[PDB]
Amino acid sequence: FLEVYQDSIQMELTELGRVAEREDLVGEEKLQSIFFVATDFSSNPDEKKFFQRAVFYPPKSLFQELKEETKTYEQLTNRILRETLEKIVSEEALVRWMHVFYALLDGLSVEHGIYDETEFELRRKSAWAVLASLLK
Amino acid sequence: FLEVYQDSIQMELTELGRVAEREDLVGEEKLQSIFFVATDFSSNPDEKKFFQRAVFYPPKSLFQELKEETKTYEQLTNRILRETLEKIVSEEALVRWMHVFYALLDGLSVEHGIYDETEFELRRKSAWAVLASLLK
């Protein structure tokens, strides 16, 4: 199981990394690209579901095991966001943006399960528009 | 079960209705007030956990049952948001704000489970600050 989680984490990190290493993007574009990778819930839907359960509702049994490597995935996603954000906004704006990024990601993740694809995509676009509004 | 759900829905709608009937607040304050009721995940923790399971991950057995009831609760909370928003922003801004409101509510709901109280509250305040930024 815990290797199936490391299976999910590593795949996500490598898609995010692929976006993050591109140098021909402004930050807001780089951030848009990252947000859309993180919210693409229909690609590897099982990976995405597993990951969702491992994070939001871990088994109390394995609870301490995957909390540490959930924390690891977080620290790595945070570096990518912070290195992009710190170039275009202040620290106080950066922290607020990151908090909202994760809340929208988590909310969309759940919503993906109860809305059809068309409604989901509209929601996903509202969320990115509001994130973009914070970057000017 | 469906009695326990209508239990939870009813209590939430009653608490939201209380805030909504007040006439001494501007829309923003009214919406802030509504956002804080909706995100107060601490006050009836079990009610709030039940409600989450019912909405986000319903049992496939009772799935068509709970779906109609969940839709009912949504249309009622939508009326409160719409009553308030339509007075201060355009229809296209109103729709975007509502999409984001529910995505932040849902993500914070999730997050309440994995973060401690202090960290949760910071994220709840970032979420409301970004919602407020859309209202000027």
Side-chain angles (χ1 to χ4, degrees), chain A residues 1 4-5 7-59 66-136, chain B residues 1-2 4-61 70-136:
Chain A
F1 177 91
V4 179
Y5 196 24
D7 268 31
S8 281
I9 285 171
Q10 210 57 215
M11 199 177 178
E12 174 68 359
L13 283 179
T14 187
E15 306 183 353
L16 291 167
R18 178 208 155 268
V19 171
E21 305 156 26
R22 297 172 168 239
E23 297 184 6
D24 65 332
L25 304 179
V26 305
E28 166 177 338
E29 294 163 345
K30 179 169 287 185
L31 292 168
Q32 187 177 342
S33 302
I34 291 159
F35 181 78
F36 276 84
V37 165
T39 54
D40 178 14
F41 289 123
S42 70
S43 302
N44 312 140
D46 291 352
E47 287 250 355
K48 292 295 192 310
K49 174 189 150 276
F50 174 106
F51 189 95
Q52 178 173 328
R53 211 67 206 208
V55 173
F56 302 170
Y57 302 111
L66 45 74
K67 181 167 194 281
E68 294 215 332
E69 66 178 330
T70 281
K71 162 180 145 305
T72 297
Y73 157 85
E74 273 151 6
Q75 283 177 276
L76 295 164
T77 296
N78 288 354
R79 169 192 163 276
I80 288 158
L81 295 182
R82 184 178 277 279
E83 285 189 8
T84 302
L85 282 161
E86 67 189 0
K87 297 162 73 95
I88 60 168
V89 298
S90 69
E91 184 61 12
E92 63 279 13
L94 179 151
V95 169
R96 179 171 290 173
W97 199 96
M98 283 180 35
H99 287 173
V100 176
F101 173 91
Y102 285 108
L104 290 168
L105 174 53
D106 289 348
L108 285 163
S109 165
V110 159
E111 286 175 2
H112 181 86
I114 65 195
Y115 282 98
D116 57 51
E117 167 63 11
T118 295
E119 185 75 38
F120 171 76
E121 292 294 351
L122 296 170
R123 306 290 187 121
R124 180 191 193 197
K125 282 170 183 88
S126 292
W128 169 253
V130 171
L131 285 167
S133 73
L134 298 166
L135 304 175
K136 298 301 187 50
Chain B
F1 186 85
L2 284 179
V4 178
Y5 195 22
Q6 271 160 338
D7 266 33
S8 293
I9 291 167
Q10 193 83 302
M11 194 164 177
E12 182 57 16
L13 284 177
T14 298
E15 208 173 347
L16 292 163
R18 180 65 186 80
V19 170
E21 299 160 9
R22 291 172 173 240
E23 299 192 8
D24 62 334
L25 320 166
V26 302
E28 184 272 347
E29 293 155 348
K30 182 171 276 180
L31 293 164
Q32 184 175 345
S33 301
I34 291 162
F35 182 78
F36 275 83
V37 169
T39 54
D40 175 24
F41 288 124
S42 302
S43 76
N44 288 320
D46 292 343
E47 203 124 15
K48 302 299 159 66
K49 215 158 198 177
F50 176 99
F51 189 91
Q52 252 62 256
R53 280 180 232 154
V55 172
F56 294 172
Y57 305 101
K60 226 216 311 192
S61 357
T70 284
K71 168 162 181 168
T72 298
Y73 153 86
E74 288 166 357
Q75 295 174 318
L76 297 168
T77 64
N78 284 4
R79 273 166 196 160
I80 290 161
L81 298 182
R82 186 168 279 279
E83 161 213 291
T84 303
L85 284 160
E86 64 186 1
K87 297 185 220 174
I88 58 176
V89 301
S90 66
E91 181 65 11
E92 63 280 12
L94 181 154
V95 170
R96 179 170 294 174
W97 198 95
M98 283 176 49
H99 289 171
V100 171
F101 174 91
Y102 286 108
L104 294 166
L105 174 52
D106 290 346
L108 284 161
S109 173
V110 168
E111 288 178 359
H112 182 86
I114 56 185
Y115 287 96
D116 60 36
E117 168 64 7
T118 293
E119 295 294 330
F120 172 75
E121 292 296 352
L122 299 166
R123 288 166 168 82
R124 182 191 191 194
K125 287 171 177 72
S126 294
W128 170 255
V130 168
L131 286 168
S133 75
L134 299 165
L135 306 174
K136 295 171 163 194

PDB file of all heavy atoms in Angstrom, chain A residues 12 28 62 64 79 109, unseen atoms left out:
ATOM      1  N   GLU A  12       2.881  12.420  -9.548  1.00  0.00           N
ATOM      2  CA  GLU A  12       2.332  13.752  -9.545  1.00  0.00           C
ATOM      3  C   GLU A  12       3.474  14.748  -9.522  1.00  0.00           C
ATOM      4  O   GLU A  12       3.471  15.735 -10.263  1.00  0.00           O
ATOM      5  CB  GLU A  12       1.401  13.937  -8.359  1.00  0.00           C
ATOM      6  CG  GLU A  12       0.878  15.371  -8.193  1.00  0.00           C
ATOM      7  CD  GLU A  12      -0.078  15.803  -9.302  1.00  0.00           C
ATOM      8  OE1 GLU A  12      -0.347  15.004 -10.239  1.00  0.00           O
ATOM      9  OE2 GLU A  12      -0.566  16.956  -9.229  1.00  0.00           O
ATOM     10  N   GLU A  28       2.416  33.763 -13.609  1.00  0.00           N
ATOM     11  CA  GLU A  28       0.963  33.569 -13.631  1.00  0.00           C
ATOM     12  C   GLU A  28       0.590  32.466 -14.633  1.00  0.00           C
ATOM     13  O   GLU A  28      -0.295  31.628 -14.370  1.00  0.00           O
ATOM     14  CB  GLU A  28       0.241  34.881 -13.978  1.00  0.00           C
ATOM     15  CG  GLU A  28      -1.229  34.663 -14.351  1.00  0.00           C
ATOM     16  CD  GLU A  28      -2.007  35.951 -14.645  1.00  0.00           C
ATOM     17  OE1 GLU A  28      -1.593  37.034 -14.193  1.00  0.00           O
ATOM     18  OE2 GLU A  28      -3.076  35.888 -15.295  1.00  0.00           O
ATOM     19  N   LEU A  62      -2.689   2.949   9.499  1.00  0.00           N
ATOM     20  CA  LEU A  62      -1.461   3.349   8.815  1.00  0.00           C
ATOM     21  C   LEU A  62      -1.234   4.856   8.967  1.00  0.00           C
ATOM     22  O   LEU A  62      -0.318   5.414   8.358  1.00  0.00           O
ATOM     23  CB  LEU A  62      -1.510   2.958   7.334  1.00  0.00           C
ATOM     24  N   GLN A  64       0.011   7.223  11.028  1.00  0.00           N
ATOM     25  CA  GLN A  64       1.295   7.890  11.256  1.00  0.00           C
ATOM     26  C   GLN A  64       2.296   7.620  10.121  1.00  0.00           C
ATOM     27  O   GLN A  64       3.219   8.410   9.902  1.00  0.00           O
ATOM     28  CB  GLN A  64       1.898   7.466  12.598  1.00  0.00           C
ATOM     29  N   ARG A  79       7.598  24.168  -2.478  1.00  0.00           N
ATOM     30  CA  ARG A  79       8.799  24.759  -3.072  1.00  0.00           C
ATOM     31  C   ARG A  79       8.474  25.301  -4.471  1.00  0.00           C
ATOM     32  O   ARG A  79       8.830  26.437  -4.827  1.00  0.00           O
ATOM     33  CB  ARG A  79       9.955  23.734  -3.137  1.00  0.00           C
ATOM     34  CG  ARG A  79      11.164  24.182  -3.988  1.00  0.00           C
ATOM     35  CD  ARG A  79      12.166  23.034  -4.275  1.00  0.00           C
ATOM     36  NE  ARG A  79      13.067  23.370  -5.383  1.00  0.00           N
ATOM     37  CZ  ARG A  79      12.775  23.209  -6.673  1.00  0.00           C
ATOM     38  NH1 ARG A  79      11.601  22.700  -7.040  1.00  0.00           N
ATOM     39  NH2 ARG A  79      13.664  23.556  -7.601  1.00  0.00           N
ATOM     40  N   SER A 109     -11.319  18.706  -5.747  1.00  0.00           N
ATOM     41  CA  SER A 109     -11.058  17.279  -5.783  1.00  0.00           C
ATOM     42  C   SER A 109     -12.286  16.495  -5.349  1.00  0.00           C
ATOM     43  O   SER A 109     -12.649  15.462  -5.933  1.00  0.00           O
ATOM     44  CB  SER A 109      -9.863  16.931  -4.893  1.00  0.00           C
ATOM     45  OG  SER A 109      -9.830  15.516  -4.649  1.00  0.00           O
TER      46      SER A 109
END
